[PDB]
């Protein structure tokens, strides 16, 4: 149905009323979201249907209609903007400087902003407007707060 580029809410009617389970990015006719939002299930866009193309539970990413298109990366120095699309609330750009997740396989960017689980799949942007990753997969720090990683996929 609607394949226009932009940020989208991922909703469901399987519970009470209409519940937002996550967010996603439409870019180049491909819907990008976090795997834990949809679980690989098909999505609906008006009368049209989005069938999954690629997905990985460890990366926690999933693409619809085609391969992963997002390929920008945080430069390790600049402030980014989380386009937070919260449940029931309007889309809102929050500027922050990301921290670092140090792992046995290298360092990853991390936005220290707390949002409901329904915000998962909200894009993280650079000063150019490019999508450098998605919010929704991170850790719970000592003060109960959430610090999500900047999760980017791979463009073939």
């Amino acid at each position: 149905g609607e394949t226009t580029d932009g940020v989208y809410r991922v909703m469901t009617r399987r519970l009470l009323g209409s519940t937002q389970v996550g967010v996603g990015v439409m870019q180049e006719g491909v819907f990008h979201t976090m795997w834990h939002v949809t679980k690989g299930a098909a999505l609906r866009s008006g009368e049209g249907r989005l069938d999954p193309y690629w997905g990985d539970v460890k990366q926690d990413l999933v693409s619809y209609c085609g391969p992963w298109k997002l390929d920008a990366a945080w430069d390790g120095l600049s402030e980014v903007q989380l386009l937070a699309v919260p449940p029931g609330e309007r889309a809102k750009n929050i500027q922050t400087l990301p921290g670092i997740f140090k792992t046995k396989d290298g360092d990853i960017g991390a936005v220290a902003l707390d949002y409901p689980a329904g915000t998962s799949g909200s894009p993280i942007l650079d000063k150019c407007g490019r999508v450098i990753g998605l919010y929704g997969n991170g850790v719970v720090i000592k003060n109960g707060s959430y610090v999500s990683a900047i999760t980017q996929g791979k463009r073939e």
Partner: peptide, 22 residues
């Protein structure tokens, strides 16, 4: 599940700057 448009993907100058870098 279904999707609904929520907006454009652009950087906002003079947006709310918050959050730490741990």
């Amino acid at each position: 599940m279904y999707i609904e448009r929520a907006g454009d993907i652009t950087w906002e100058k003079d947006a709310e700057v918050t959050g730490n870098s741990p």
